[PDB]
Amino acid sequence: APAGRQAGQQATVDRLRTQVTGFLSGALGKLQALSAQNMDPELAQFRVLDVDRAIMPLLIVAENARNPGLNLVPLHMDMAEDEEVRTQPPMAGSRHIAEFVASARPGRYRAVIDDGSHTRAADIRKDASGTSVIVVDPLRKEKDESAYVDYADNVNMEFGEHAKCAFIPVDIQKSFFDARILSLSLALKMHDKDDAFAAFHETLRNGGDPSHHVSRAQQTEELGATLVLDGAPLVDARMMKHGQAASSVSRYLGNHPEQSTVPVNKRNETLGERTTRHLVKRKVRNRSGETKEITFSNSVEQKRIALLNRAASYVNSAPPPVVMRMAKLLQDSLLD
Numbered sequence: 226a227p228a229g230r231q232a233g234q235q236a237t238v239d240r241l242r243t244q245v246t247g248f249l250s251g252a253l254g255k256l257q258a259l260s261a262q263n264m265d266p267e268l269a270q271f272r273v274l275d276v277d278r279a280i281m282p283l284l285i286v287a288e289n290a291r292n293p294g295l296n297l298v299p300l301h302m303d304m305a306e307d308e309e310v311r312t313q314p315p316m317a318g319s320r321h322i323a324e325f326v327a328s329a330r331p332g333r334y335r336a337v338i339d340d341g342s343h344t345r346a347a348d349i350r351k352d353a354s355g356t357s358v359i360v361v362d363p364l365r366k367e368k369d370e371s372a373y374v375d376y377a378d379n380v381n382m383e384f385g386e387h388a389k390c391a392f393i394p395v396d397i398q399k400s401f402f403d404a405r406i407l408s409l410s411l412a413l414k415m416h417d418k419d420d421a422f423a424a425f426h427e428t429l430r431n432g433g434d435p436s437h438h439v440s441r442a443q444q445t446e447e448l449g450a451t452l453v454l455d456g457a458p459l460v461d462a463r464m465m466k467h468g469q470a471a472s473s474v475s476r477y478l479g480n481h482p483e484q485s486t487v488p489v490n491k492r493n494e495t496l497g498e499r500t501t502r503h504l505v506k507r508k509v510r511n512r513s514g515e516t517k518e519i520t521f522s523n524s525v526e527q528k529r530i531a532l533l534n535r536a537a538s539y540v541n542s543a544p545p546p547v548v549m550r551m552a553k554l555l556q557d558s559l560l561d
Protein backbone atom coordinates (compact mmCIF):
# COMPACT_ATOMS: atom_id res chain seq x y z
CA ALA A 226 0.00 0.00 0.00
CA PRO A 227 1.18 3.54 -0.81
CA ALA A 228 -1.34 5.29 1.49
CA GLY A 229 0.21 3.43 4.44
CA ARG A 230 3.46 5.29 3.78
CA GLN A 231 1.87 8.66 2.86
CA ALA A 232 1.10 10.00 6.38
CA GLY A 233 -1.99 11.84 5.09
CA GLN A 234 -0.22 13.98 2.45
CA GLN A 235 -0.97 11.87 -0.66
CA ALA A 236 -1.98 15.04 -2.53
CA THR A 237 1.17 16.97 -1.57
CA VAL A 238 3.45 13.97 -2.11
CA ASP A 239 1.91 13.24 -5.50
CA ARG A 240 2.25 16.82 -6.72
CA LEU A 241 5.81 17.02 -5.45
CA ARG A 242 6.64 13.75 -7.18
CA THR A 243 5.24 15.06 -10.49
CA GLN A 244 7.14 18.30 -9.90
CA VAL A 245 10.48 16.52 -9.50
CA THR A 246 10.00 13.98 -12.30
CA GLY A 247 8.65 16.86 -14.36
CA PHE A 248 11.92 18.74 -14.09
CA LEU A 249 14.13 15.70 -14.63
CA SER A 250 12.06 14.69 -17.66
CA GLY A 251 12.16 18.24 -19.03
CA ALA A 252 15.94 18.45 -18.81
CA LEU A 253 16.29 14.93 -20.13
CA GLY A 254 14.12 15.77 -23.15
CA LYS A 255 16.11 18.88 -23.99
CA LEU A 256 19.45 17.13 -23.49
CA GLN A 257 18.32 14.15 -25.56
CA ALA A 258 17.19 16.35 -28.45
CA LEU A 259 20.54 18.15 -28.42
CA SER A 260 22.47 14.89 -28.37
CA ALA A 261 20.30 13.21 -30.97
CA GLN A 262 20.83 16.17 -33.24
CA ASN A 263 24.58 16.16 -32.57
CA MET A 264 24.39 19.69 -31.16
CA ASP A 265 26.79 21.31 -28.72
CA PRO A 266 24.80 22.61 -25.72
CA GLU A 267 26.78 25.84 -25.34
CA LEU A 268 26.38 26.85 -28.98
CA ALA A 269 22.69 26.00 -28.65
CA GLN A 270 22.47 28.39 -25.67
CA PHE A 271 21.45 25.57 -23.34
CA ARG A 272 22.70 26.38 -19.87
CA VAL A 273 24.13 23.04 -18.82
CA LEU A 274 25.95 24.62 -15.87
CA ASP A 275 22.65 25.61 -14.29
CA VAL A 276 20.95 22.35 -15.16
CA ASP A 277 23.83 20.25 -13.82
CA ARG A 278 24.03 22.26 -10.60
CA ALA A 279 20.30 21.83 -10.04
CA ILE A 280 20.12 18.09 -10.86
CA MET A 281 23.37 17.05 -9.20
CA PRO A 282 22.06 16.85 -5.59
CA LEU A 283 19.15 14.75 -6.90
CA LEU A 284 21.54 12.46 -8.78
CA ILE A 285 23.53 11.97 -5.59
CA VAL A 286 20.41 10.92 -3.69
CA ALA A 287 19.43 8.46 -6.43
CA GLU A 288 22.93 6.98 -6.65
CA ASN A 289 23.31 6.65 -2.87
CA ALA A 290 20.05 4.70 -2.79
CA ARG A 291 20.97 2.69 -5.89
CA ASN A 292 24.33 1.66 -4.42
CA PRO A 293 24.25 1.25 -0.63
CA GLY A 294 27.72 2.05 0.70
CA LEU A 295 28.52 4.61 -2.00
CA ASN A 296 27.91 7.24 0.68
CA LEU A 297 28.42 10.08 -1.75
CA VAL A 298 28.50 13.56 -0.21
CA PRO A 299 28.74 16.92 -1.99
CA LEU A 300 31.53 19.06 -0.56
CA HIS A 301 33.03 22.43 -1.35
CA MET A 302 36.31 24.18 -0.65
CA ASP A 303 36.67 27.58 1.07
CA MET A 304 36.91 29.54 -2.20
CA ALA A 305 33.50 28.16 -3.19
CA GLU A 306 32.08 30.38 -0.45
CA ASP A 307 33.55 33.45 -2.16
CA GLU A 308 30.69 35.16 -4.00
CA GLU A 309 33.10 37.41 -5.89
CA VAL A 310 35.36 34.76 -7.41
CA ARG A 311 33.20 31.66 -7.86
CA THR A 312 31.35 30.98 -11.12
CA GLN A 313 28.39 29.40 -9.31
CA PRO A 314 27.37 28.90 -5.69
CA PRO A 315 27.80 25.28 -4.46
CA MET A 316 24.98 22.83 -5.15
CA ALA A 317 22.10 22.55 -2.70
CA GLY A 318 23.10 20.62 0.42
CA SER A 319 26.85 20.98 -0.19
CA ARG A 320 28.98 20.92 2.94
CA HIS A 321 32.15 22.85 3.67
CA ILE A 322 35.04 20.38 3.80
CA ALA A 323 36.33 21.59 7.19
CA GLU A 324 32.85 21.31 8.67
CA PHE A 325 32.37 17.83 7.20
CA VAL A 326 35.70 16.39 8.40
CA ALA A 327 35.06 17.80 11.87
CA SER A 328 31.56 16.43 12.46
CA ALA A 329 31.19 13.46 10.09
CA ARG A 330 30.62 10.05 11.57
CA PRO A 331 33.62 7.83 11.03
CA GLY A 332 33.39 5.71 7.91
CA ARG A 333 33.98 5.55 4.19
CA TYR A 334 32.73 8.32 1.89
CA ARG A 335 32.76 9.47 -1.70
CA ALA A 336 32.60 13.12 -2.64
CA VAL A 337 32.34 15.52 -5.51
CA ILE A 338 34.36 18.57 -4.52
CA ASP A 339 33.46 22.04 -5.73
CA ASP A 340 36.00 24.89 -5.61
CA GLY A 341 33.60 27.44 -7.08
CA SER A 342 34.43 26.91 -10.73
CA HIS A 343 35.58 23.31 -10.96
CA THR A 344 34.56 19.94 -9.52
CA ARG A 345 36.64 16.86 -8.66
CA ALA A 346 35.89 13.38 -7.30
CA ALA A 347 37.22 12.04 -3.99
CA ASP A 348 37.35 8.89 -1.87
CA ILE A 349 37.41 9.67 1.86
CA ARG A 350 38.18 7.61 4.98
CA LYS A 351 37.71 8.95 8.50
CA ASP A 352 38.23 7.02 11.71
CA ALA A 353 39.63 7.43 15.20
CA SER A 354 43.15 7.92 13.82
CA GLY A 355 42.08 10.70 11.47
CA THR A 356 41.00 11.38 7.91
CA SER A 357 42.58 10.21 4.64
CA VAL A 358 41.36 11.33 1.18
CA ILE A 359 42.15 10.33 -2.41
CA VAL A 360 41.21 13.01 -4.97
CA VAL A 361 40.77 12.30 -8.68
CA ASP A 362 40.55 15.38 -10.91
CA PRO A 363 38.93 14.68 -14.32
CA LEU A 364 40.72 17.76 -15.66
CA ARG A 365 44.41 17.89 -16.53
CA LYS A 366 45.10 21.15 -18.40
CA GLU A 367 48.20 22.55 -16.70
CA LYS A 368 51.13 23.20 -19.02
CA ASP A 369 53.78 23.10 -16.31
CA GLU A 370 53.14 20.03 -14.15
CA SER A 371 54.28 21.91 -11.07
CA ALA A 372 50.91 23.56 -10.66
CA TYR A 373 49.57 20.17 -9.58
CA VAL A 374 51.89 20.35 -6.59
CA ASP A 375 49.97 23.42 -5.44
CA TYR A 376 46.63 21.72 -6.13
CA ALA A 377 47.69 18.75 -4.00
CA ASP A 378 48.75 20.98 -1.10
CA ASN A 379 45.59 23.13 -1.22
CA VAL A 380 43.26 20.12 -1.04
CA ASN A 381 45.32 18.66 1.81
CA MET A 382 44.89 22.04 3.57
CA GLU A 383 41.07 21.88 3.28
CA PHE A 384 41.05 18.53 5.04
CA GLY A 385 43.62 19.94 7.47
CA GLU A 386 47.35 19.27 7.62
CA HIS A 387 47.15 16.09 9.67
CA ALA A 388 44.95 14.49 7.01
CA LYS A 389 46.60 12.15 4.53
CA CYS A 390 46.02 13.21 0.94
CA ALA A 391 46.55 11.91 -2.58
CA PHE A 392 45.91 14.08 -5.64
CA ILE A 393 45.51 12.40 -9.05
CA PRO A 394 44.95 14.68 -12.09
CA VAL A 395 43.60 12.71 -15.08
CA ASP A 396 43.16 13.88 -18.69
CA ILE A 397 39.44 13.11 -19.14
CA GLN A 398 37.68 16.46 -19.49
CA LYS A 399 38.09 18.66 -22.54
CA SER A 400 34.84 20.65 -22.42
CA PHE A 401 34.19 23.56 -20.13
CA PHE A 402 31.04 22.23 -18.47
CA ASP A 403 31.48 18.46 -17.89
CA ALA A 404 33.42 18.46 -14.57
CA ARG A 405 30.36 17.70 -12.42
CA ILE A 406 29.10 14.73 -14.40
CA LEU A 407 32.64 13.35 -14.84
CA SER A 408 33.31 13.64 -11.09
CA LEU A 409 30.06 11.89 -10.20
CA SER A 410 31.04 9.12 -12.58
CA LEU A 411 34.52 8.91 -11.06
CA ALA A 412 32.99 8.73 -7.58
CA LEU A 413 30.86 5.76 -8.65
CA LYS A 414 33.92 4.03 -10.05
CA MET A 415 35.68 4.58 -6.72
CA HIS A 416 32.93 2.66 -4.96
CA ASP A 417 33.25 0.06 -7.68
CA LYS A 418 36.98 -0.17 -6.93
CA ASP A 419 36.38 0.15 -3.19
CA ASP A 420 39.03 -2.39 -2.27
CA ALA A 421 41.68 -0.77 -4.45
CA PHE A 422 41.10 2.64 -2.92
CA ALA A 423 40.96 1.22 0.60
CA ALA A 424 44.40 -0.29 0.04
CA PHE A 425 45.72 3.08 -1.12
CA HIS A 426 44.21 4.68 1.99
CA GLU A 427 46.24 2.27 4.15
CA THR A 428 49.50 3.04 2.34
CA LEU A 429 48.83 6.75 2.79
CA ARG A 430 48.12 6.33 6.50
CA ASN A 431 51.17 4.13 7.01
CA GLY A 432 53.51 6.16 4.81
CA GLY A 433 54.31 3.20 2.57
CA ASP A 434 55.37 2.96 -1.07
CA PRO A 435 52.60 4.30 -3.34
CA SER A 436 53.91 2.31 -6.28
CA HIS A 437 51.87 -0.67 -5.13
CA HIS A 438 48.90 1.32 -6.37
CA VAL A 439 50.02 3.90 -8.92
CA SER A 440 52.83 4.17 -11.46
CA ARG A 441 54.26 7.62 -10.77
CA ALA A 442 54.03 9.53 -7.50
CA GLN A 443 55.84 12.19 -5.47
CA GLN A 444 55.78 14.06 -2.16
CA THR A 445 54.90 17.75 -2.29
CA GLU A 446 57.26 18.27 0.67
CA GLU A 447 55.28 21.25 1.87
CA LEU A 448 52.31 19.29 3.16
CA GLY A 449 53.52 15.76 2.49
CA ALA A 450 50.63 15.10 0.13
CA THR A 451 51.18 12.42 -2.49
CA LEU A 452 50.96 13.91 -5.96
CA VAL A 453 50.16 11.18 -8.49
CA LEU A 454 51.05 12.16 -12.08
CA ASP A 455 50.25 8.61 -13.28
CA GLY A 456 47.34 6.87 -11.54
CA ALA A 457 47.42 3.53 -13.38
CA PRO A 458 46.65 0.91 -12.47
CA LEU A 459 44.44 2.49 -9.77
CA VAL A 460 43.15 4.66 -12.61
CA ASP A 461 42.29 1.82 -15.00
CA ALA A 462 40.43 1.62 -18.31
CA ARG A 463 37.02 1.82 -16.65
CA MET A 464 37.94 5.20 -15.12
CA MET A 465 38.95 6.49 -18.57
CA LYS A 466 35.66 5.53 -20.23
CA HIS A 467 34.32 9.08 -20.53
CA GLY A 468 37.51 10.52 -22.05
CA GLN A 469 36.35 13.32 -24.33
CA ALA A 470 39.37 13.53 -26.63
CA ALA A 471 40.09 10.42 -28.68
CA SER A 472 43.77 11.23 -28.29
CA SER A 473 43.49 11.12 -24.48
CA VAL A 474 42.09 7.59 -24.63
CA SER A 475 44.59 6.54 -27.30
CA ARG A 476 47.55 8.07 -25.45
CA TYR A 477 46.51 6.37 -22.21
CA LEU A 478 46.31 2.98 -23.91
CA GLY A 479 49.59 3.69 -25.67
CA ASN A 480 51.14 4.32 -22.26
CA HIS A 481 49.40 1.37 -20.61
CA PRO A 482 48.86 -1.27 -23.35
CA GLU A 483 47.77 -3.82 -20.77
CA GLN A 484 44.62 -1.70 -20.30
CA SER A 485 43.64 -2.03 -23.96
CA THR A 486 42.10 -5.50 -23.79
CA VAL A 487 40.20 -5.43 -20.49
CA PRO A 488 36.40 -5.28 -20.79
CA VAL A 489 34.99 -1.96 -19.55
CA ASN A 490 31.36 -3.05 -19.45
CA LYS A 491 29.02 -6.03 -19.50
CA ARG A 492 28.71 -5.92 -23.29
CA ASN A 493 32.47 -6.82 -23.25
CA GLU A 494 33.73 -3.73 -25.06
CA THR A 495 37.34 -2.62 -24.71
CA LEU A 496 38.06 1.03 -23.92
CA GLY A 497 38.98 1.68 -27.57
CA GLU A 498 35.91 -0.12 -28.93
CA ARG A 499 33.59 1.80 -26.60
CA THR A 500 35.27 5.16 -27.24
CA THR A 501 35.19 4.67 -31.01
CA ARG A 502 31.43 3.96 -30.82
CA HIS A 503 30.90 7.36 -29.13
CA LEU A 504 32.84 9.50 -31.62
CA VAL A 505 31.00 12.43 -33.17
CA LYS A 506 32.02 15.38 -35.35
CA ARG A 507 30.38 18.72 -34.47
CA LYS A 508 30.96 22.43 -33.93
CA VAL A 509 31.88 23.58 -30.44
CA ARG A 510 32.71 27.06 -29.01
CA ASN A 511 36.39 28.00 -29.30
CA ARG A 512 38.19 29.16 -26.13
CA SER A 513 38.85 33.59 -34.17
CA GLY A 514 36.48 32.45 -35.31
CA GLU A 515 33.86 31.75 -32.64
CA THR A 516 33.21 28.07 -33.43
CA LYS A 517 35.55 25.20 -34.23
CA GLU A 518 34.71 21.74 -35.57
CA ILE A 519 36.13 18.75 -33.72
CA THR A 520 35.85 15.00 -33.47
CA PHE A 521 35.41 13.75 -29.93
CA SER A 522 33.61 11.25 -27.71
CA ASN A 523 30.08 12.19 -26.65
CA SER A 524 30.18 9.58 -23.83
CA VAL A 525 29.67 12.21 -21.10
CA GLU A 526 26.59 13.78 -22.64
CA GLN A 527 25.17 10.23 -22.87
CA LYS A 528 26.12 9.55 -19.26
CA ARG A 529 24.34 12.71 -18.13
CA ILE A 530 21.25 11.45 -19.89
CA ALA A 531 21.60 7.96 -18.42
CA LEU A 532 22.03 9.45 -14.94
CA LEU A 533 18.87 11.49 -15.40
CA ASN A 534 17.01 8.40 -16.59
CA ARG A 535 18.09 6.54 -13.44
CA ALA A 536 17.14 9.42 -11.21
CA ALA A 537 13.68 9.84 -12.72
CA SER A 538 12.90 6.12 -12.54
CA TYR A 539 13.95 6.17 -8.91
CA VAL A 540 11.74 9.16 -8.13
CA ASN A 541 8.66 7.58 -9.79
CA SER A 542 8.50 4.84 -7.19
CA ALA A 543 10.51 6.39 -4.35
CA PRO A 544 8.98 6.53 -0.85
CA PRO A 545 7.33 9.80 0.26
CA PRO A 546 10.20 11.05 2.53
CA VAL A 547 12.64 10.70 -0.36
CA VAL A 548 10.28 12.56 -2.70
CA MET A 549 10.05 15.25 -0.02
CA ARG A 550 13.82 15.50 0.30
CA MET A 551 14.42 15.69 -3.46
CA ALA A 552 11.70 18.27 -3.98
CA LYS A 553 13.32 20.37 -1.26
CA LEU A 554 16.78 20.01 -2.82
CA LEU A 555 15.30 21.16 -6.12
CA GLN A 556 13.75 24.22 -4.44
CA ASP A 557 16.92 24.98 -2.48
CA SER A 558 18.90 25.28 -5.71
CA LEU A 559 17.37 28.75 -6.05
CA LEU A 560 18.47 30.22 -2.68
CA ASP A 561 22.02 31.50 -3.32
Ligand SMILES: O=P(O)(O)O[C@H]1[C@@H](OP(=O)(O)O)[C@@H](OP(=O)(O)O)[C@@H](OP(=O)(O)O)[C@@H](OP(=O)(O)O)[C@H]1OP(=O)(O)O
Binds near residue numbers: 417466489490491
Ligand atom coordinates in the same frame (compact mmCIF):
# COMPACT_ATOMS: atom_id res chain seq x y z
O1 LIG B 1 29.18 3.41 -12.90
P1 LIG B 1 27.72 3.05 -13.17
O2 LIG B 1 26.89 4.33 -13.03
O3 LIG B 1 27.21 2.09 -12.12
O4 LIG B 1 27.45 2.48 -14.72
C1 LIG B 1 28.11 1.48 -15.22
C2 LIG B 1 28.50 1.70 -16.70
O5 LIG B 1 28.33 3.00 -17.10
P2 LIG B 1 29.72 3.90 -17.38
O6 LIG B 1 30.03 4.05 -18.86
O7 LIG B 1 29.71 5.27 -16.68
O8 LIG B 1 30.87 3.12 -16.78
C3 LIG B 1 28.09 0.65 -17.82
O9 LIG B 1 27.63 1.27 -18.84
P3 LIG B 1 28.27 1.59 -20.35
O10 LIG B 1 29.66 1.04 -20.59
O11 LIG B 1 27.34 1.00 -21.40
O12 LIG B 1 28.33 3.11 -20.57
C4 LIG B 1 27.07 -0.46 -17.34
O13 LIG B 1 26.27 -0.81 -18.34
P4 LIG B 1 26.54 -2.19 -19.18
O14 LIG B 1 27.59 -2.99 -18.41
O15 LIG B 1 25.26 -3.05 -19.32
O16 LIG B 1 27.06 -1.91 -20.59
C5 LIG B 1 26.33 -0.34 -15.98
O17 LIG B 1 25.16 0.32 -15.97
P5 LIG B 1 23.62 -0.48 -16.14
O18 LIG B 1 23.69 -1.89 -15.54
O19 LIG B 1 22.51 0.29 -15.40
O20 LIG B 1 23.14 -0.62 -17.60
C6 LIG B 1 27.47 0.06 -15.02
O21 LIG B 1 27.21 -0.25 -13.74
P6 LIG B 1 28.29 -1.03 -12.79
O22 LIG B 1 29.70 -0.65 -13.27
O23 LIG B 1 28.15 -0.67 -11.29
O24 LIG B 1 28.13 -2.56 -12.89
